[PDB]
Amino acid sequence: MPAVVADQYLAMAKELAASRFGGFTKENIPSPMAQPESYGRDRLGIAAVATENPKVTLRAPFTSEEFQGALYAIYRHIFGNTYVMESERPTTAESQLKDGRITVRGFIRLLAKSEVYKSRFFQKTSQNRFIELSHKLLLGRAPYDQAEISYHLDLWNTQGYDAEIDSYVDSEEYLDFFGEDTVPFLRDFKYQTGQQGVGYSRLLNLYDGYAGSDTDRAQSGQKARLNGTIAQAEPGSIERPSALQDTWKFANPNYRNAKPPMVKALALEPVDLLFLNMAKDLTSVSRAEWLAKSYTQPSRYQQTETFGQERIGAVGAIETPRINLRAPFTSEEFQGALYAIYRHIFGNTYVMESERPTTAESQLKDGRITVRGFIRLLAKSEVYKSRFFQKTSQNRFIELSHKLLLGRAPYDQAEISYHLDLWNTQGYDAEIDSYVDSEEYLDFFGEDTVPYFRGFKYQTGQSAEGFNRLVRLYDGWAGSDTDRNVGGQVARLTANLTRGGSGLEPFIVMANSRR
Amino acid sequence: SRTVITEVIATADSQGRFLNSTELQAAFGRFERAVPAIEAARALTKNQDALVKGAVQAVFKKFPYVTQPGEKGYGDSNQAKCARDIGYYLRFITYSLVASGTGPLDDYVIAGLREVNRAFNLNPLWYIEALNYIKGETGKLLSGQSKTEALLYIDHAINALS
Amino acid sequence: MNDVFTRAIAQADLKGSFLLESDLDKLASFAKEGVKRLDAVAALTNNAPAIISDAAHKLFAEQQELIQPGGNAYPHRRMAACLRDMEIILRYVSYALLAGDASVLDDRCLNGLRETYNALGTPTQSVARAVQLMKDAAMVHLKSTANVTVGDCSSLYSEAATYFDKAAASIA
Amino acid sequence: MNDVFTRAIAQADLKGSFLLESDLDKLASFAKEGVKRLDAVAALTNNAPAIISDAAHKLFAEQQELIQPGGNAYPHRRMAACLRDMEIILRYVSYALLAGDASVLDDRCLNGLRETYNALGTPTQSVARAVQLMKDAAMVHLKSTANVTVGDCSSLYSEAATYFDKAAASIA
Ligand SMILES: CCC1=C(C)/C(=C/C2=NC(=C\c3[nH]c(/C=C4\NC(=O)[C@H](C)[C@H]4CC)c(C)c3CCC(=O)O)/C(CCC(=O)O)=C2C)NC1=O
Ligand SMILES: CCC1=C(C)/C(=C/C2=NC(=C\c3[nH]c(/C=C4\NC(=O)[C@H](C)[C@H]4CC)c(C)c3CCC(=O)O)/C(CCC(=O)O)=C2C)NC1=O
Ligand SMILES: CCC1=C(C)/C(=C/C2=NC(=C\c3[nH]c(/C=C4\NC(=O)[C@H](C)[C@H]4CC)c(C)c3CCC(=O)O)/C(CCC(=O)O)=C2C)NC1=O
Ligand SMILES: CCC1=C(C)/C(=C/C2=NC(=C\c3[nH]c(/C=C4\NC(=O)[C@H](C)[C@H]4CC)c(C)c3CCC(=O)O)/C(CCC(=O)O)=C2C)NC1=O
Ligand SMILES: CCC1=C(C)/C(=C/C2=NC(=C\c3[nH]c(/C=C4\NC(=O)[C@H](C)[C@H]4CC)c(C)c3CCC(=O)O)/C(CCC(=O)O)=C2C)NC1=O
Ligand SMILES: CCC1=C(C)/C(=C/C2=NC(=C\c3[nH]c(/C=C4\NC(=O)[C@H](C)[C@H]4CC)c(C)c3CCC(=O)O)/C(CCC(=O)O)=C2C)NC1=O
Ligand SMILES: CCC1=C(C)/C(=C/C2=NC(=C\c3[nH]c(/C=C4\NC(=O)[C@H](C)[C@H]4CC)c(C)c3CCC(=O)O)/C(CCC(=O)O)=C2C)NC1=O
Ligand SMILES: CCC1=C(C)/C(=C/C2=NC(=C\c3[nH]c(/C=C4\NC(=O)[C@H](C)[C@H]4CC)c(C)c3CCC(=O)O)/C(CCC(=O)O)=C2C)NC1=O
Ligand SMILES: CCC1=C(C)/C(=C/C2=NC(=C\c3[nH]c(/C=C4\NC(=O)[C@H](C)[C@H]4CC)c(C)c3CCC(=O)O)/C(CCC(=O)O)=C2C)NC1=O
C-alpha cells in the first residue's frame, strides 16, 4: 500500500508536531483562554507605570546623567503629567538637592509646597480633588476611606496647607515605600501588604493612561472624580482609554461562562423544572459521589437478611445451636443435650416422664455409648416405633426417618424402594441401622453431634426438590410429627417423590415461550 | 442476630427453660455497656464521610498498583464501589455497636465473605487496610470505653477478613 | 430471632442507612430502662408455677368440658400436654419481654402452632382463654411493688399484655 | 470595620437608646463563646498552608485551562498571584471570624475585588470556586477535635461558612 499522503504534507505535519514538546497530546494543549503573561497590564494600559519604568533612586553622591534623569522622572510624576515650562523649573531647589542639603523626600516636599503644585492641584480644585491627587502623586495610591478625607480636610483647615503636605510626606507609609532616596511611584498596581480591595480600581480611575495628565486646563476644569465613590465606599471605574481596545482581542477570560439556551427546557408531564434538576444532578457534581449514592439507594425488594427463612418458617431450625456431647461432660451440658435430642428425634412430640429412657441415659452418661448409639437406641425404642412406625404406612415412616435421623428429605423414589425392601427382608432394626450407619449421618453428625435439619441449605447431591420436600415435611417450630392428629399419621411426599415433581414443568417451559 | 440478649434467649430456649440469674446478669451487663457503645456509634455515624474517604485514600496509598489502568482500582465505578464497601463495613460496625454483638457483622458481612471475595477477586488486604485506618481515627475520635467497644468490633471485622 | 436493637438495624438496612439520632435515642432509652425490664422478667420467671396453676384452676372451672371423658384434657396425657403448652407460652412471653420484640414469639412460639392445634382438634378458643388467664395471673406479679424499688413501669405492663394478646390472637 | 459589639452599639445609637437587656445578654453570650471562637480562629491560622494547597490542587485539577499555556494562572507570576490571593482572602475570613462581623472582610478585602478581576481579565467565577474549595478545606480543619476540649461549635461552623460564602458571592 503506497504512500497515502504526499511527502510535503507529512513534513509539514511532522514539523508542526515537533515544535511542541510531546507533540500533540491531550494534556499539553494550549489554554482556550489565550492570555499572554502581559495580558492584564497591557489591556489596562498600565504596563509602563507598573512594570516597565524602573524606580528612580538618587543618593547624595551621583553623576550628571542620574541627576538629570531623576529630575525628569520627578517632574513627570509630582506635577501630574502636566507640562512644566522652563520659567517654572525650580533652580534653587535642585541646587539644594544636588548639594545634598535636601534629599529626594525634601525635594518632593518643596515641590508640593510650590505654586506649580498649588496652581495645578489646589487653587482651582475642591479639597476632595486635592486629597485624591495628593494621595496619587505623593503616596502612589488612592484614598481608601472617607476618614482620610475628613482627616486631611480638618488638618488643612486647622493648620494650613504646609502641614497637610507634611502629613503626606512625613507619613510612615511614604517612608516605608519610598524612604528618602527614591521618587514616588504609583504603587497600588501591585499587591503590597496593607492594600485594600478598592485601591486598585480607584487608582486605575485616577490614572488616565500614559498620555493623560492631571491638568487644571481642561474645559470642564479640575474636578474630583472620587468624591462620591469614597463616601459610598464603592470601588472605582475601570474604563480605560480608547486606544486600548486593539490589544489581545482573542483572549477569552469568560471561557467557563455558559451560553443560555434560546428557550428553557420544560417538562409538560412528571414538574416544569424536572429536566433542569436532572441536568444539575448529572453535570454539576462529580460522578464519584453520584455513583456512590446510586449504589446505596434502598432496593425495591425490601428484603431483610432473614427474609426467605421467615417465609419457609425455618429461622429457628437454622439458628439453633449445634449440640455436641463429648465424653467428659457437665450436668448442664448433658441435660441440654438430652433436651435437644428429644426435641429432634421425637419430632417435637411431648414425651412424658414415664416414657423417658433412664437406662439409655445412664449408658450415655457413663460413656458406654455415643450420641450416635443413643440415637440408634431411641429410634429402636417403643416411643419412636409407636409414633412413627406402627400407625403409618412405610412411606410415611421412610420420609419421617429421613427427616428425623438425617435432617433432610428423600431425594428420589429409589430411597423409598430401597428402605421398604430393607425393612421387609431384614426387619426394623436393620432399617434404623442403615440410617445411623450411613455415610451421610457420619459425615454430618458423626458419633457426637445431635442430628439437625440440614436440608434448609443446599446439600451436595440434593435434587432441588429435597429443599421443597423438607419445607413440606417441616411444619414450623411449634409443629410436631404426632400420630394424634385427627386423620392419623399420613404420608406427604408420595406423589411428588414418584412423579419427580409437580408435573407442570413442560407447561412452564411452554409459557416462558410466546405465552 | 447474635447479640447478648439473643444468645441468652437462645441458650435458655435450647435447654427449654426460663431465664435465670446468669442470663439476667448477662443482660444487665449489656444494658450497662449500651451507653458507651451507643454513643461510640453516634460518633462513628457523625464522621462517616471523612472516615470512608480516608479509608479509601489509605487503601490507595498502601496499594498504588490498583489505581493505574487495567485492574481493580481503576475507574470511577470501581472507586465508587470501594467507597460503598467501606461504608458498608462502617455501617455494620455501628450496627454491631448498637446491638452489642457481632451479629450484624457475622450475619451481613462475614457470612459468605471469602467465597464472594474470591469470586470477584477482591483482595481482603484492601479492606484490612481500610479498617486499620478506621481504627486509627476511631482512636482519636473516641475516648474511654467507647473507643474500646469500637475497637473490639473493628478488630472482629479485621480478624474475619484475615 | 431479633431483639429491639436488631429489629431497628434490620429496618435501617432496608434503607441502606445508618441509625438515626432519634432511633439511637430510642435505643438508649430502652437500655436505660432495662433494669425494670429485668425485674419484670424475673417476676414472670420466678412466679411461673403460680401463674400456670392459677390459670389452670380458673380455666377448668370455667370450662368443665375440657376435663370430662371426651374432653381435650381428659386423660393424664392430655392434661400434661396442656400444662406443658401453658408453661411454654409463658416462657416465650418472658423471652419476648426481655428481648423487647415479639419476634421470638412469631419465629418460634407461634410459628406452626395454630395449625398444630387445628390438626389435633384442640379448641383454640380455650387455649386463648388459658393465655388470657395467664395474662391476668401475671399482671398481679408484674405490678407487685414488694421487694423492688418503686417506680413507673406501666409501659412494661402494657408490653407484656400485648405479648400475651399476640399469643392469644395467633392461637384463636 | 467593627465587631459585633460595635454593631450593637451602632444600632442602639441610631435609635438613640441604651442597649436593651436582650442585646446585653446577646453580647455576653458572644463573650462567653469567645473561647471557642478563638479556637476556630487558631484552627484557621495554623492550617492555612494546607488549606490553600488543597484548594489550589482541586481548583487546577478541576479547571485545567488556568494552568496551561495561555491560562490565567499559567506562568509562575500568575500562579503566585493566585496563591497569594487565596492567602489574603483566607486571612480576612479569619479576621471576620474573630470579630464576629464580616465588616472587615467586606470593607477591606472584598469591596473592589470584582472590579480588579474584571480589569485584569481574571475569571471571577474561578476565584469564587477557589474560595469555595478553601471553605471546604477550612471546615475540615475546624471540626478537628484533636488537641481541643470537646463541645458543640455548630454556630461557629455556620458563621465561618457564611463568611466564606459572602466572599465567594462578592468576588463572583
Ligand atoms: C506619553 C507621551 C505624552 C503625550 C503625547 C502628551 C500630550 C499632551 N499634550 C498636552 C497639552 C497640549 N497639546 C497641544 C497641541 C495641539 N494644540 C495645537 O493646536 C496643535 C494643533 C496641536 C499639536 C500639534 C496644546 C496646545 C496643548 C496645551 C493645551 C492647553 O494649554 O490648553 C498635554 C496636557 C499637559 C499640561 O498642559 O499640563 C498632554 C499630556 N503628554 C505625554 O506625556
Ligand atoms: C474646601 C471646599 C470643600 C468643602 C467646604 C467641602 C465640604 C465637606 N463636607 C464634608 C462632610 C460634612 N459636612 C457637613 C455639614 C452639613 N451637614 C449638616 O447637616 C449641615 C446642614 C450642613 C452644614 C451647615 C457634615 C455634618 C458633614 C459630615 C457628614 C458625614 O460624616 O457623613 C466633607 C467630608 C469630610 C467629613 O466627613 O467631615 C467635605 C469634604 N469639601 C470641599 O472640597
Ligand atoms: C413453639 C413451642 C411449642 C408449643 C407452643 C407447642 C405446643 C404443642 N402442644 C401439643 C399437644 C397438646 N396441647 C394441648 C393443650 C390444649 N389442650 C386443651 O385442653 C387446652 C385448652 C389447651 C392448653 C391451654 C393438648 C391437650 C395436647 C395433646 C393433644 C392430645 O394428646 O391428643 C403439641 C403436639 C406435640 C404432642 O402432641 O406431643 C404441640 C407441638 N409445642 C412446642 O414445641
Ligand atoms: C407396608 C405397607 C406398604 C406397602 C405394601 C407398600 C407398597 C409399595 N409398592 C411399591 C412398588 C410396586 N408395587 C407393585 C405391585 C403391583 N405389581 C402389579 O402391578 C400388581 C397388579 C401389583 C401387585 C399384585 C409393583 C410392580 C411395584 C413397582 C412399581 C415401579 O417400579 O414402578 C412401592 C414403591 C417403592 C418400591 O418400588 O418398592 C410401595 C411403597 N407401601 C407401603 O407403605
Ligand atoms: C441441585 C440443583 C439446586 C439448586 C440450583 C439449588 C439452589 C438453592 N438456592 C437457594 C437460596 C438462594 N439462591 C439465591 C440465588 C438467586 N438469588 C440472586 O438474586 C440471583 C438472582 C439468583 C442466582 C443467579 C439466593 C440469593 C439465595 C438465598 C435466599 C435466602 O435464603 O434468602 C437454596 C436454599 C438453601 C441455601 O440458601 O443454600 C437452594 C436450595 N438447589 C438445588 O437443589
Ligand atoms: C440478677 C437479675 C437482676 C435484676 C432482677 C435486676 C433489677 C434492678 N432493679 C433495679 C431498681 C428498679 N427496679 C424497678 C422496677 C419496679 N418498679 C415497680 O415497682 C415495678 C413493680 C417493678 C418493675 C415492673 C425500678 C422502677 C427501679 C428503679 C430504677 C429506675 O427507676 O430507673 C436495679 C438498679 C438499682 C437502683 O435503683 O440503683 C436493678 C439492677 N438487676 C439484675 O442484674
Ligand atoms: C511557566 C513556567 C512554569 C513551570 C516551570 C511550572 C512548574 C509546575 N509544575 C507543577 C506540577 C508538578 N511538577 C512536578 C515535577 C516533579 N515531578 C517529578 O517527577 C520530578 C522529580 C520533578 C520535576 C523535576 C510535580 C511532582 C508536580 C505536582 C505538584 C503537585 O501539585 O502536587 C506545578 C503545579 C501546578 C499543577 O498542578 O500542574 C507547577 C507550577 N509551572 C509553570 O507555569
Ligand atoms: C487586600 C485585598 C486584595 C486582593 C485579594 C487583591 C488581589 C489582586 N490580584 C491581582 C492579580 C492576580 N490575581 C490572580 C488570581 C486568579 N488567578 C486564577 O484565576 C484564580 C481563579 C484566581 C486566584 C484564586 C492572578 C492570576 C493575577 C495576575 C493577573 C495579572 O497580573 O495580569 C492583583 C493585581 C496586582 C498584582 O498582580 O499583584 C490584585 C490587586 N488585591 C487586594 O487589594
Ligand atoms: C491562647 C489563645 C486561646 C486558645 C487556643 C484557647 C483555647 C481554649 N478552649 C477552651 C475550652 C473549649 N474550647 C472549645 C472549642 C472546641 N469545641 C469543639 O471541639 C471545636 C472543634 C472546637 C472549636 C470549634 C469548647 C467547646 C470548649 C469548652 C466550653 C467553653 O469553655 O467555652 C479553653 C478553656 C479551658 C479548657 O477547657 O480547655 C481554652 C483556654 N483559648 C485562648 O484564649
PDB file of N, CA, C and O in Angstrom, chain A residues 256, chain B residues 53 57, chain D residues 50-64 66-67 83 86 126 129-130 132-134 136-137 140:
ATOM      1  N   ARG A 256     -15.396  29.747  30.953  1.00  0.00           N
ATOM      2  CA  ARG A 256     -16.290  28.871  31.698  1.00  0.00           C
ATOM      3  C   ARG A 256     -17.740  29.331  31.667  1.00  0.00           C
ATOM      4  O   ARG A 256     -18.612  28.603  32.148  1.00  0.00           O
TER       5      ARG A 256
ATOM      6  N   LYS B  53     -13.746   8.366  53.205  1.00  0.00           N
ATOM      7  CA  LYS B  53     -12.801   8.945  52.259  1.00  0.00           C
ATOM      8  C   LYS B  53     -11.371   8.647  52.672  1.00  0.00           C
ATOM      9  O   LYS B  53     -10.534   8.285  51.837  1.00  0.00           O
ATOM     10  N   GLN B  57      -8.552   6.462  50.654  1.00  0.00           N
ATOM     11  CA  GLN B  57      -7.251   7.045  50.357  1.00  0.00           C
ATOM     12  C   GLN B  57      -6.118   6.217  50.939  1.00  0.00           C
ATOM     13  O   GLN B  57      -5.069   6.079  50.307  1.00  0.00           O
TER      14      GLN B  57
ATOM     15  N   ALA D  50      -1.978  24.333  54.421  1.00  0.00           N
ATOM     16  CA  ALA D  50      -2.619  23.115  53.952  1.00  0.00           C
ATOM     17  C   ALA D  50      -3.934  23.427  53.261  1.00  0.00           C
ATOM     18  O   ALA D  50      -4.243  22.866  52.204  1.00  0.00           O
ATOM     19  N   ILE D  51      -4.720  24.330  53.844  1.00  0.00           N
ATOM     20  CA  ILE D  51      -5.998  24.707  53.250  1.00  0.00           C
ATOM     21  C   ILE D  51      -5.791  25.221  51.837  1.00  0.00           C
ATOM     22  O   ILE D  51      -6.458  24.779  50.891  1.00  0.00           O
ATOM     23  N   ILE D  52      -4.858  26.150  51.668  1.00  0.00           N
ATOM     24  CA  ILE D  52      -4.669  26.766  50.365  1.00  0.00           C
ATOM     25  C   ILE D  52      -4.015  25.821  49.375  1.00  0.00           C
ATOM     26  O   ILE D  52      -4.362  25.836  48.193  1.00  0.00           O
ATOM     27  N   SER D  53      -3.092  24.971  49.819  1.00  0.00           N
ATOM     28  CA  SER D  53      -2.538  23.975  48.916  1.00  0.00           C
ATOM     29  C   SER D  53      -3.623  23.037  48.415  1.00  0.00           C
ATOM     30  O   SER D  53      -3.673  22.716  47.222  1.00  0.00           O
ATOM     31  N   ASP D  54      -4.510  22.595  49.306  1.00  0.00           N
ATOM     32  CA  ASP D  54      -5.580  21.695  48.899  1.00  0.00           C
ATOM     33  C   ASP D  54      -6.528  22.372  47.924  1.00  0.00           C
ATOM     34  O   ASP D  54      -6.895  21.797  46.893  1.00  0.00           O
ATOM     35  N   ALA D  55      -6.941  23.597  48.238  1.00  0.00           N
ATOM     36  CA  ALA D  55      -7.861  24.302  47.358  1.00  0.00           C
ATOM     37  C   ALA D  55      -7.225  24.574  46.002  1.00  0.00           C
ATOM     38  O   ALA D  55      -7.898  24.489  44.972  1.00  0.00           O
ATOM     39  N   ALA D  56      -5.925  24.883  45.974  1.00  0.00           N
ATOM     40  CA  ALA D  56      -5.236  25.071  44.703  1.00  0.00           C
ATOM     41  C   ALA D  56      -5.180  23.782  43.901  1.00  0.00           C
ATOM     42  O   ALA D  56      -5.416  23.788  42.687  1.00  0.00           O
ATOM     43  N   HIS D  57      -4.859  22.667  44.555  1.00  0.00           N
ATOM     44  CA  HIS D  57      -4.818  21.387  43.858  1.00  0.00           C
ATOM     45  C   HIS D  57      -6.167  21.059  43.240  1.00  0.00           C
ATOM     46  O   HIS D  57      -6.253  20.702  42.062  1.00  0.00           O
ATOM     47  N   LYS D  58      -7.238  21.193  44.019  1.00  0.00           N
ATOM     48  CA  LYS D  58      -8.562  20.913  43.475  1.00  0.00           C
ATOM     49  C   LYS D  58      -8.955  21.898  42.385  1.00  0.00           C
ATOM     50  O   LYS D  58      -9.558  21.503  41.385  1.00  0.00           O
ATOM     51  N   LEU D  59      -8.629  23.178  42.547  1.00  0.00           N
ATOM     52  CA  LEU D  59      -9.027  24.154  41.540  1.00  0.00           C
ATOM     53  C   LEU D  59      -8.345  23.887  40.213  1.00  0.00           C
ATOM     54  O   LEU D  59      -8.971  23.993  39.155  1.00  0.00           O
ATOM     55  N   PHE D  60      -7.063  23.550  40.241  1.00  0.00           N
ATOM     56  CA  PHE D  60      -6.360  23.321  38.991  1.00  0.00           C
ATOM     57  C   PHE D  60      -6.557  21.922  38.440  1.00  0.00           C
ATOM     58  O   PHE D  60      -6.281  21.706  37.259  1.00  0.00           O
ATOM     59  N   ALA D  61      -7.012  20.971  39.252  1.00  0.00           N
ATOM     60  CA  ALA D  61      -7.433  19.692  38.699  1.00  0.00           C
ATOM     61  C   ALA D  61      -8.796  19.820  38.044  1.00  0.00           C
ATOM     62  O   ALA D  61      -9.057  19.212  37.004  1.00  0.00           O
ATOM     63  N   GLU D  62      -9.674  20.612  38.648  1.00  0.00           N
ATOM     64  CA  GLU D  62     -10.992  20.838  38.079  1.00  0.00           C
ATOM     65  C   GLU D  62     -10.925  21.723  36.844  1.00  0.00           C
ATOM     66  O   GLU D  62     -11.572  21.436  35.834  1.00  0.00           O
ATOM     67  N   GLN D  63     -10.155  22.803  36.903  1.00  0.00           N
ATOM     68  CA  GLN D  63     -10.118  23.791  35.831  1.00  0.00           C
ATOM     69  C   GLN D  63      -8.714  23.839  35.251  1.00  0.00           C
ATOM     70  O   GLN D  63      -7.934  24.737  35.572  1.00  0.00           O
ATOM     71  N   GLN D  64      -8.407  22.893  34.373  1.00  0.00           N
ATOM     72  CA  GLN D  64      -7.075  22.778  33.803  1.00  0.00           C
ATOM     73  C   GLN D  64      -6.706  23.935  32.894  1.00  0.00           C
ATOM     74  O   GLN D  64      -5.520  24.132  32.627  1.00  0.00           O
ATOM     75  N   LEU D  66      -6.579  26.956  33.429  1.00  0.00           N
ATOM     76  CA  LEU D  66      -5.904  28.053  34.102  1.00  0.00           C
ATOM     77  C   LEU D  66      -4.397  27.864  34.081  1.00  0.00           C
ATOM     78  O   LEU D  66      -3.649  28.837  33.969  1.00  0.00           O
ATOM     79  N   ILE D  67      -3.935  26.618  34.153  1.00  0.00           N
ATOM     80  CA  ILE D  67      -2.518  26.325  34.309  1.00  0.00           C
ATOM     81  C   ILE D  67      -1.862  25.896  33.004  1.00  0.00           C
ATOM     82  O   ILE D  67      -0.704  25.482  33.012  1.00  0.00           O
ATOM     83  N   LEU D  83      -2.161  32.081  44.298  1.00  0.00           N
ATOM     84  CA  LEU D  83      -1.997  31.527  45.636  1.00  0.00           C
ATOM     85  C   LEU D  83      -1.950  32.628  46.682  1.00  0.00           C
ATOM     86  O   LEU D  83      -2.438  32.454  47.807  1.00  0.00           O
ATOM     87  N   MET D  86      -5.489  33.671  47.429  1.00  0.00           N
ATOM     88  CA  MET D  86      -6.111  32.706  48.327  1.00  0.00           C
ATOM     89  C   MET D  86      -5.666  32.930  49.771  1.00  0.00           C
ATOM     90  O   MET D  86      -6.501  32.970  50.684  1.00  0.00           O
ATOM     91  N   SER D 126     -13.926  31.484  38.612  1.00  0.00           N
ATOM     92  CA  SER D 126     -12.887  30.594  39.109  1.00  0.00           C
ATOM     93  C   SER D 126     -12.404  31.028  40.484  1.00  0.00           C
ATOM     94  O   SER D 126     -12.102  30.186  41.334  1.00  0.00           O
ATOM     95  N   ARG D 129     -14.912  29.792  42.867  1.00  0.00           N
ATOM     96  CA  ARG D 129     -14.708  28.362  43.048  1.00  0.00           C
ATOM     97  C   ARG D 129     -13.559  28.084  44.005  1.00  0.00           C
ATOM     98  O   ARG D 129     -13.633  27.168  44.833  1.00  0.00           O
ATOM     99  N   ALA D 130     -12.480  28.857  43.897  1.00  0.00           N
ATOM    100  CA  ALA D 130     -11.346  28.672  44.794  1.00  0.00           C
ATOM    101  C   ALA D 130     -11.724  29.006  46.227  1.00  0.00           C
ATOM    102  O   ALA D 130     -11.330  28.299  47.161  1.00  0.00           O
ATOM    103  N   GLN D 132     -14.648  28.644  47.458  1.00  0.00           N
ATOM    104  CA  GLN D 132     -15.496  27.549  47.928  1.00  0.00           C
ATOM    105  C   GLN D 132     -14.674  26.331  48.339  1.00  0.00           C
ATOM    106  O   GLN D 132     -14.935  25.709  49.377  1.00  0.00           O
ATOM    107  N   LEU D 133     -13.696  25.956  47.519  1.00  0.00           N
ATOM    108  CA  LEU D 133     -12.839  24.830  47.871  1.00  0.00           C
ATOM    109  C   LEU D 133     -12.095  25.110  49.165  1.00  0.00           C
ATOM    110  O   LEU D 133     -11.941  24.230  50.024  1.00  0.00           O
ATOM    111  N   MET D 134     -11.629  26.343  49.312  1.00  0.00           N
ATOM    112  CA  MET D 134     -10.909  26.748  50.501  1.00  0.00           C
ATOM    113  C   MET D 134     -11.833  26.766  51.712  1.00  0.00           C
ATOM    114  O   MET D 134     -11.410  26.422  52.818  1.00  0.00           O
ATOM    115  N   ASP D 136     -14.292  24.481  52.043  1.00  0.00           N
ATOM    116  CA  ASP D 136     -14.444  23.080  52.429  1.00  0.00           C
ATOM    117  C   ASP D 136     -13.225  22.581  53.195  1.00  0.00           C
ATOM    118  O   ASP D 136     -13.356  21.892  54.217  1.00  0.00           O
ATOM    119  N   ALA D 137     -12.030  22.938  52.730  1.00  0.00           N
ATOM    120  CA  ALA D 137     -10.824  22.548  53.453  1.00  0.00           C
ATOM    121  C   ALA D 137     -10.792  23.158  54.851  1.00  0.00           C
ATOM    122  O   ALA D 137     -10.453  22.480  55.833  1.00  0.00           O
ATOM    123  N   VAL D 140     -13.028  21.290  57.131  1.00  0.00           N
ATOM    124  CA  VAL D 140     -12.395  20.055  57.584  1.00  0.00           C
ATOM    125  C   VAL D 140     -11.457  20.344  58.744  1.00  0.00           C
ATOM    126  O   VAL D 140     -11.394  19.588  59.718  1.00  0.00           O
TER     127      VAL D 140
END
